[PDB]
Amino acid sequence: GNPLVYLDVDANGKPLGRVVLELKADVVPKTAENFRALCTGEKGFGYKGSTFHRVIPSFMCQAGDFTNHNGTGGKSIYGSRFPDENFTLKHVGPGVLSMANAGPNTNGSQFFICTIKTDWLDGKHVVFGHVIEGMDVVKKIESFGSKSGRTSKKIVITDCGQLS
Template structure:
């Protein structure tokens, strides 16, 4: 029989979640010196109990813990380079800023951990990739149910606060390649 302390510890282990925080700014393109307009803040819960490797990759890019050549790299200052209304918002390419960059805390692309969590509705955080085993730094947040992505992209978190911010980003006017006409920048990010 488990003691009360052991039982509580077991419950904690089973429900282990990590939360990260992203704050977004919009840069006005018509100024010689950028004018930042606050878009808002999103709080994201990572599914570290289901996909620990994927969650840790994202967490370290949020906190700046990961360093390349001794310099912290990650999502701070990164843009959302692709926005498709009624589908998803994509960001995380701090390498090239256009969806072609790849970097991970594992020093290269890493394998899909599992596909247990489905793209069942809006606000789910998932890995952007170019095929099996090509996960890196890019991610997207679903704006609706996207079940055709199940088995192809690893869901590793969800927005727990700030869905309105996601909707604001989703509705930014876009140009060629679904690139937002106004840059949407991750101004701050970290662990809560």
């Protein structure tokens, strides 16, 4: 079946717990595979040690810039950027996992987890999974955001990987 992956997240050096994500490889195999491999680190790079750098309460929590840690960087397992696979899955509510981008066909490694329905992103960001377990952890992360996106605690993915 579809991959299950995890992110273990610290805030100011203390553990919040684990977010478990299902990746919809049935719908978006290329996008799911990128995220899966960045979680395991099997290509020699990935999410381990990187941050949630942009967090906006009542919107989303964004992470995955493991090169610049500020929202300008990241890279995929295919190359620096890759196309929008499809827009078949929608931003239906809290827990949606979707690719951050800088316009059409600029997926790399940055991603976000929604804390509300974000319907205006449909057709612009590729949705590729959802939170299976750990929305409590996501709500903690969310609570350390601000309107500007600046975080009030240092939010770090200390460990990540594949469960199945």
